Amino acid sequence: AFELPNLPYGFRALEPHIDQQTMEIHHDKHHNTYVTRLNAAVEGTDLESKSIEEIVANLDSVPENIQTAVRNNGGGHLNHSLFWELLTPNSEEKGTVVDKIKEQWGSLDAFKEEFANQAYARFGSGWAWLVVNDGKLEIVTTPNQDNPLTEGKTPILGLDVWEHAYYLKYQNKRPDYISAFWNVVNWEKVDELYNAAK
Amino acid sequence: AFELPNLPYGFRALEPHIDQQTMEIHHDKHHNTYVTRLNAAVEGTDLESKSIEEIVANLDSVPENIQTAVRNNGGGHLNHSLFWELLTPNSEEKGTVVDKIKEQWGSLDAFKEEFANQAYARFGSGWAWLVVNDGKLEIVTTPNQDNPLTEGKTPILGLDVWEHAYYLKYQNKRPDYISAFWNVVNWEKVDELYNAAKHHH
Ligand SMILES: [Br-]
Ligand SMILES: [Mn+2]
Ligand SMILES: [Mn+2]
């Protein structure tokens, strides 16, 4: 069965960029619900032994009757699992991917502009991603809990732009949330995900 | 140009079922953004003189360069315009549609159960609707700001299940929001929309 991973920090560790009420409800309620419904679908099937990454990457090996449950709750589990590890109270804009971003976009600032534009433009619920696409850094967004793995793209940074991720602190103000996010990005985790793509 | 409609009650009128902070932000910010972007898309074109009902029912015909903006922002404008008039501080569970619902589902409660189930199951952003679909009552849900009119179904009740509609008061507890919603449904508006639906064509 899949396990709800602990946050790597206390609920208050990302203040004042993300509020502790959100960190608690987002993790203990929203992510936990994805794990409940994912397990209800996959527990007792030949998918149960597989990594969530293998499953989400290969949704056409999911039998038709649970395909939607797995895509949505499997996606929910993978996306939130990545997100918690991609946040930190000790953010430093350094390392492999930051250097590659400066190289490709000319500056980290230009990168943040495009990331924020794409994240802002995602209509309804979804995610903004920095992915590796056959060696190439690319910014994409996905609806709901869809994940670039399914399209053969390796996610190395993700921002949750479902309203549950920002409404308590920021309400309608998604751009302020996106701006706040830069303060808590775990670039060490980004580097790890990038290195494993290779 | 399209206009943000005035609420027919105060921001506090739907308490405790919908919180005044949400009523103000949802109307003055979320709906207003849809109106702004609809107007940015259509102003100075032949679409500016058409009803939002006509535009949304006919998204297929909207020029390709503005079709997504009109689908999302025109949808947004129609959906919220319907929603405000379908809420009331003076809800009475009676009339033509309540009577038809009792006949079809056997009780209002059985109807509420199916509606609440579909509204809860809608994954991500969207709307739960009661529609007239070729003369029969049908519960459907739509993603984002999509509207049953585009598929030739007439909406007579809608519930916003975007998280902005419920997160400040209910957070993750969408079912408690849906439960609250019944206390503020304007069945007089539902009756009016139904009656129009029967004579649409
Ligand atoms: Br801590
Ligand atoms: Mn989330
Ligand atoms: Mn809304």
mmCIF file of C-alpha atoms in Angstrom, chain B residues 37-195:
data_model
loop_
_atom_site.group_PDB
_atom_site.id
_atom_site.type_symbol
_atom_site.label_atom_id
_atom_site.label_comp_id
_atom_site.label_asym_id
_atom_site.label_seq_id
_atom_site.Cartn_x
_atom_site.Cartn_y
_atom_site.Cartn_z
ATOM 1 C CA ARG B 37 -11.566 39.543 -19.733
ATOM 2 C CA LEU B 38 -14.855 38.801 -21.585
ATOM 3 C CA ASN B 39 -15.023 42.543 -22.468
ATOM 4 C CA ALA B 40 -11.283 42.601 -23.453
ATOM 5 C CA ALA B 41 -12.058 39.700 -25.880
ATOM 6 C CA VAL B 42 -15.390 40.820 -27.482
ATOM 7 C CA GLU B 43 -15.548 44.678 -27.174
ATOM 8 C CA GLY B 44 -15.663 46.305 -30.652
ATOM 9 C CA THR B 45 -16.667 42.944 -32.285
ATOM 10 C CA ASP B 46 -20.131 41.592 -33.332
ATOM 11 C CA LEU B 47 -20.151 39.474 -30.085
ATOM 12 C CA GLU B 48 -20.468 42.635 -27.887
ATOM 13 C CA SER B 49 -24.202 42.979 -28.845
ATOM 14 C CA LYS B 50 -25.028 39.268 -28.184
ATOM 15 C CA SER B 51 -26.368 37.831 -24.859
ATOM 16 C CA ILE B 52 -23.796 35.834 -22.800
ATOM 17 C CA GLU B 53 -26.385 32.950 -23.092
ATOM 18 C CA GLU B 54 -26.165 33.103 -26.946
ATOM 19 C CA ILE B 55 -22.284 33.374 -26.886
ATOM 20 C CA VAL B 56 -21.800 30.413 -24.451
ATOM 21 C CA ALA B 57 -24.388 28.173 -26.252
ATOM 22 C CA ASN B 58 -22.418 28.889 -29.496
ATOM 23 C CA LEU B 59 -18.711 28.833 -28.397
ATOM 24 C CA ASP B 60 -18.005 26.655 -31.513
ATOM 25 C CA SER B 61 -18.612 29.760 -33.744
ATOM 26 C CA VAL B 62 -16.403 32.191 -31.663
ATOM 27 C CA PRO B 63 -13.238 33.159 -33.628
ATOM 28 C CA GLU B 64 -10.295 30.810 -32.777
ATOM 29 C CA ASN B 65 -8.070 33.663 -31.430
ATOM 30 C CA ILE B 66 -10.525 34.541 -28.558
ATOM 31 C CA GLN B 67 -12.450 31.199 -28.219
ATOM 32 C CA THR B 68 -10.541 30.008 -25.062
ATOM 33 C CA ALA B 69 -10.805 33.505 -23.406
ATOM 34 C CA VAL B 70 -14.582 33.577 -24.191
ATOM 35 C CA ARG B 71 -15.167 29.927 -23.114
ATOM 36 C CA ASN B 72 -13.406 30.561 -19.735
ATOM 37 C CA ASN B 73 -14.354 34.234 -19.039
ATOM 38 C CA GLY B 74 -17.796 34.210 -20.767
ATOM 39 C CA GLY B 75 -18.520 30.905 -19.002
ATOM 40 C CA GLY B 76 -17.336 32.567 -15.764
ATOM 41 C CA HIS B 77 -19.661 35.564 -16.341
ATOM 42 C CA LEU B 78 -22.761 33.414 -17.152
ATOM 43 C CA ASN B 79 -22.128 30.898 -14.328
ATOM 44 C CA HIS B 80 -21.696 33.551 -11.559
ATOM 45 C CA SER B 81 -24.597 35.670 -12.998
ATOM 46 C CA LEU B 82 -26.839 32.559 -12.611
ATOM 47 C CA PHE B 83 -25.332 31.691 -9.167
ATOM 48 C CA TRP B 84 -26.050 35.094 -7.483
ATOM 49 C CA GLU B 85 -29.740 35.023 -8.598
ATOM 50 C CA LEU B 86 -30.069 31.324 -7.519
ATOM 51 C CA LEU B 87 -29.117 32.244 -3.888
ATOM 52 C CA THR B 88 -31.456 34.063 -1.430
ATOM 53 C CA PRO B 89 -31.757 34.852 2.296
ATOM 54 C CA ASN B 90 -35.470 33.847 1.838
ATOM 55 C CA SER B 91 -35.224 30.178 0.577
ATOM 56 C CA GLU B 92 -38.546 28.226 0.372
ATOM 57 C CA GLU B 93 -38.365 24.555 -0.779
ATOM 58 C CA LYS B 94 -41.522 24.584 -2.934
ATOM 59 C CA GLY B 95 -42.857 25.310 -6.437
ATOM 60 C CA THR B 96 -42.950 23.778 -9.940
ATOM 61 C CA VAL B 97 -39.421 22.251 -10.062
ATOM 62 C CA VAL B 98 -39.541 20.986 -6.410
ATOM 63 C CA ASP B 99 -42.873 19.264 -7.372
ATOM 64 C CA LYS B 100 -41.263 17.682 -10.545
ATOM 65 C CA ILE B 101 -38.169 16.638 -8.470
ATOM 66 C CA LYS B 102 -40.454 14.922 -5.879
ATOM 67 C CA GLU B 103 -42.222 12.982 -8.751
ATOM 68 C CA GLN B 104 -38.929 11.968 -10.478
ATOM 69 C CA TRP B 105 -36.595 11.226 -7.479
ATOM 70 C CA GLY B 106 -39.492 10.358 -5.082
ATOM 71 C CA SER B 107 -38.403 13.031 -2.516
ATOM 72 C CA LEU B 108 -36.438 16.344 -2.478
ATOM 73 C CA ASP B 109 -34.003 14.503 -0.111
ATOM 74 C CA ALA B 110 -33.301 11.763 -2.743
ATOM 75 C CA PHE B 111 -32.601 14.576 -5.276
ATOM 76 C CA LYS B 112 -30.305 16.389 -2.750
ATOM 77 C CA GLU B 113 -28.443 13.070 -2.171
ATOM 78 C CA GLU B 114 -27.649 12.565 -5.919
ATOM 79 C CA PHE B 115 -26.850 16.296 -6.417
ATOM 80 C CA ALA B 116 -24.541 16.260 -3.346
ATOM 81 C CA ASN B 117 -22.851 13.023 -4.608
ATOM 82 C CA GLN B 118 -22.158 14.500 -8.105
ATOM 83 C CA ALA B 119 -21.054 17.906 -6.650
ATOM 84 C CA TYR B 120 -18.625 16.111 -4.253
ATOM 85 C CA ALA B 121 -17.260 13.778 -7.023
ATOM 86 C CA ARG B 122 -16.427 16.685 -9.439
ATOM 87 C CA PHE B 123 -12.582 16.510 -9.388
ATOM 88 C CA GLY B 124 -10.787 19.890 -9.564
ATOM 89 C CA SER B 125 -12.631 23.151 -10.389
ATOM 90 C CA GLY B 126 -16.203 23.208 -11.713
ATOM 91 C CA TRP B 127 -19.977 23.410 -11.229
ATOM 92 C CA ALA B 128 -22.816 21.045 -10.265
ATOM 93 C CA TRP B 129 -26.052 21.652 -12.237
ATOM 94 C CA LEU B 130 -29.692 20.657 -12.464
ATOM 95 C CA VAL B 131 -30.458 20.887 -16.233
ATOM 96 C CA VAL B 132 -33.373 20.338 -18.591
ATOM 97 C CA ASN B 133 -31.878 17.945 -21.226
ATOM 98 C CA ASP B 134 -34.410 17.431 -24.095
ATOM 99 C CA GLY B 135 -37.354 17.864 -21.655
ATOM 100 C CA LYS B 136 -36.115 15.648 -18.752
ATOM 101 C CA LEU B 137 -34.451 16.740 -15.445
ATOM 102 C CA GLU B 138 -30.754 15.634 -15.254
ATOM 103 C CA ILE B 139 -27.967 16.316 -12.693
ATOM 104 C CA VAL B 140 -24.621 16.995 -14.458
ATOM 105 C CA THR B 141 -21.282 18.594 -13.499
ATOM 106 C CA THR B 142 -18.911 20.638 -15.733
ATOM 107 C CA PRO B 143 -15.187 21.461 -15.480
ATOM 108 C CA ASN B 144 -13.838 24.982 -14.795
ATOM 109 C CA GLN B 145 -16.344 27.514 -16.273
ATOM 110 C CA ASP B 146 -17.874 25.172 -18.941
ATOM 111 C CA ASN B 147 -21.727 25.485 -19.024
ATOM 112 C CA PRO B 148 -24.383 22.887 -20.037
ATOM 113 C CA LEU B 149 -25.815 25.398 -22.627
ATOM 114 C CA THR B 150 -22.778 24.577 -24.880
ATOM 115 C CA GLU B 151 -24.085 20.932 -25.028
ATOM 116 C CA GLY B 152 -27.746 22.029 -25.516
ATOM 117 C CA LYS B 153 -28.829 21.475 -21.877
ATOM 118 C CA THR B 154 -30.513 24.407 -20.019
ATOM 119 C CA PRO B 155 -29.266 25.024 -16.444
ATOM 120 C CA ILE B 156 -31.991 25.795 -13.811
ATOM 121 C CA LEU B 157 -29.790 25.307 -10.671
ATOM 122 C CA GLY B 158 -25.991 25.566 -10.293
ATOM 123 C CA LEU B 159 -23.501 25.228 -7.413
ATOM 124 C CA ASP B 160 -19.932 26.615 -7.692
ATOM 125 C CA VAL B 161 -17.520 23.906 -6.379
ATOM 126 C CA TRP B 162 -14.365 25.881 -7.268
ATOM 127 C CA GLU B 163 -12.407 25.926 -3.938
ATOM 128 C CA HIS B 164 -12.664 29.798 -3.894
ATOM 129 C CA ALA B 165 -16.458 29.317 -3.382
ATOM 130 C CA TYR B 166 -16.045 27.428 -0.043
ATOM 131 C CA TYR B 167 -12.404 27.317 1.177
ATOM 132 C CA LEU B 168 -12.469 30.273 3.648
ATOM 133 C CA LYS B 169 -15.380 28.786 5.703
ATOM 134 C CA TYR B 170 -15.192 25.013 4.879
ATOM 135 C CA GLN B 171 -11.553 24.389 3.745
ATOM 136 C CA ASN B 172 -11.351 20.710 2.541
ATOM 137 C CA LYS B 173 -14.949 19.931 3.682
ATOM 138 C CA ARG B 174 -16.778 20.364 0.329
ATOM 139 C CA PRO B 175 -19.712 18.166 1.561
ATOM 140 C CA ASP B 176 -20.426 20.600 4.497
ATOM 141 C CA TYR B 177 -20.567 23.476 1.922
ATOM 142 C CA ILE B 178 -22.975 21.502 -0.337
ATOM 143 C CA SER B 179 -25.086 20.717 2.813
ATOM 144 C CA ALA B 180 -25.126 24.477 3.680
ATOM 145 C CA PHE B 181 -26.087 25.477 0.076
ATOM 146 C CA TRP B 182 -29.614 23.963 0.361
ATOM 147 C CA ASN B 183 -30.504 26.595 3.028
ATOM 148 C CA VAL B 184 -30.048 29.497 0.509
ATOM 149 C CA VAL B 185 -31.391 28.031 -2.825
ATOM 150 C CA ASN B 186 -33.778 30.448 -4.641
ATOM 151 C CA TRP B 187 -36.411 27.937 -5.930
ATOM 152 C CA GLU B 188 -38.383 30.915 -7.407
ATOM 153 C CA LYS B 189 -35.387 31.570 -9.737
ATOM 154 C CA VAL B 190 -35.141 27.774 -10.458
ATOM 155 C CA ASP B 191 -38.894 27.830 -11.419
ATOM 156 C CA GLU B 192 -38.361 30.903 -13.695
ATOM 157 C CA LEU B 193 -35.367 29.231 -15.519
ATOM 158 C CA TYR B 194 -37.300 25.906 -15.865
ATOM 159 C CA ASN B 195 -40.414 27.698 -17.261
#
